[PDB]
Amino acid sequence: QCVNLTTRTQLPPAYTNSFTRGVYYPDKVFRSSVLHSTQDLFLPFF
Amino acid sequence: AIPTNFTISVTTEILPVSMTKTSVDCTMYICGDSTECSNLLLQYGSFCTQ
Ligand SMILES: *[C@@H]1O[C@H](CO)[C@@H](O)[C@H](O)[C@H]1NC(C)=O
Numbered sequence: 001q002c003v004n005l006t007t008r009t010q011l012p013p014a015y016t017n018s019f020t021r022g023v024y025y026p027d028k029v030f031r032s033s034v035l036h037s038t039q040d041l042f043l044p045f046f
Numbered sequence: 047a048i049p050t051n052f053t054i055s056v057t058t059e060i061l062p063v064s065m066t067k068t069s070v071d072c073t074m075y076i077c078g079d080s081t082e083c084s085n086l087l088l089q090y091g092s093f094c095t096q
Pocket of ligand 1: 002003004
């Protein structure tokens with residue numbers, strides 16, 4: 001049982017800037033006071 | 047024996063002062079333009095930083 005939604009007012013897709021967001025720990029290992037380089041699926045800055 | 051005349055001799059000597067400055071790109075020398083190879087080169091990055 002489902003019903004469509006009719007009162008719709010849509011606009012073009014707004015865009016905004018990702019200010020250095022979307023970084024995750026690449027592994028389950030504790031690292032402290034270190035500069036670590038990793039290549040992976042990351043959200044590019046800005 | 048005492049000299050009674052002289053000559054003014056001009057001697058040329060050459061000395062190398064510098065050599066051609068050079069720079070090397072690890073990534074495009076070792077792993078030419080392939081991403082698969084360049085990913086494997088990250089763990090050796092320290093060596094290139096040397
Ligand atoms: C409206 O709802 C029905 C089923 O509930 C669905 O088949 C239909 O695709 C919906 N209308 C549109 C434009 O998708």
